[PDB]
């Protein structure tokens, strides 16, 4: 859970609290890209929005509806030994917190829901583009009138339709009156804790940016009903959403390595240093996005951003010796100390000063066929690189790797600008 909170802690109790969740199915990227963009680009000014951007991260990493079965059928009866049991308890505890008032759960769904049968794509059994409640009223909730809230949220969404077929409709699943097998989902659990709970479906028939657009419209519609004041730093239209999903300023930082751009990496990065003795899901990974991760695939390690494959790492596992903190480098004739893990911009040249006990391998530069070269003490320019070794498709970013005996001492990237 990540908090979207006012800057003044005192403002947290001055409006309602919403819990916003997505990605309970790992192949529903509209939901988890919406929670991502909300975390990255919105501000909450009073009250609080608690966000679990992806409920089923292992499944997301494999572009899969649910590696351990349908996680959204696990909120009622559940075997204590179910692999998702611990996760389910964490989620139920968030839902049932006294400080939470409302719950919004995002999904992507086939076709377009209609309350009367129109055709195979548009009918009451389809799920796309509807706003869903379990029943019209939850007695004892802060906001018991789920129907009024839903109808008003639907008004907001429907003021912004991209095409008439995308019109949102209310779906009331009357869950408590239905079969036992229909009562196993997240929002029904939530209403049983006297929370107002809603699900938003965006149609799987839409491109990703349009799915995310509709999720964001539903989030904004509901925040307006709850009187949780907010801002965003962009205009909400599909082009603008697309631009932010596909933002060139997105980065990932693996372990103690430098930040790397997410987009336009080469599709495969070879001899890529990773810490040894560390299970892939335990390798530290930081990003300015909230849906980035690593996952093993055969002997490769995939860098995932939601369902998007950003690169395939071909790793070599090695001890990450943390002793080396900085390196004396000359950049465009200007001598300086460069921190291990940095990205440095180079207009013309660089030069690494020689070090006792440390060997530098500039990846893409060579002066011999030596397998473990020391390339400190060379003045290096763009023309000296075999471009195929660049980190990026643009052939501008190169790795410098440092070694102390048989251990890895760190990496610095150079970016030719
Ligand atoms: Ca922004
Ligand atoms: Ca779903
Ligand atoms: Ca080299």
Author numbering: 22 to 438
Text from the published report:
To provide the structural basis for understanding the molecular function of H. pylori Csd4, we have determined its crystal structure in three different states: (i) a ligand-free form (Csd4-unbound), (ii) a substrate-bound form (Csd–muramyltripeptide) complexed with the synthetic peptidoglycan fragment NAM-tripeptide (NAM-l-Ala-γ-d-Glu-mDAP) and (iii) a product-bound form (Csd4–mDAP) complexed with mDAP, one of the two products. Since the crystallization reservoir solution contained calcium chloride, we have assigned the three metal ions as Ca2+. Therefore, our crystallized enzyme with a Ca2+ ion in the active site is a noncompetent variant. The anomalous difference map clearly showed that this metal ion is not Zn2+ in the Csd4-unbound crystal. Among the three structures of Csd4, the β9–α5 loop region (residues Thr196–Ala206) containing two 310-helices exhibits the largest structural variation. This region is moved towards the active site in the Csd4–muramyltripeptide and Csd4–mDAP structures when we compare them with Csd4-unbound. The side chain of Arg94 interacts with the flap via a strong salt bridge with Glu202 in all three structures. It points towards the active site in both the Csd4–muramyltripeptide and Csd4–mDAP structures, whereas it points away from the active site in the Csd4-unbound structure. Csd4 exists as monomers in the crystals, as the largest surface areas buried at the interface between two neighbouring monomers within the crystals are 502, 467 and 481 Å2 per monomer (2.7, 2.5 and 2.6% of the monomer surface area) for the Csd4-unbound, Csd4–muramyltripeptide and Csd4–mDAP structures, respectively.
Csd4 has been identified as one of the cell shape-determining peptidoglycan hydrolases in H. pylori. Csd4 is a Zn2+-dependent d,l-carboxypeptidase (d,l-CPase) which cleaves the γ-d-Glu2-mDAP3 bond of the non-cross-linked peptidoglycan muramyltripeptide (muramyl-l-Ala1-γ-d-Glu2-mDAP3) to produce the corresponding muramyl­dipeptide (muramyl-l-Ala-γ-d-Glu) and mDAP. H. pylori Csd4 consists of three domains: an N-terminal CPase domain (residues 22–267), a central β-barrel domain with a novel fold (residues 268–340) and a C-terminal immunoglublin-like domain (residues 341–438).
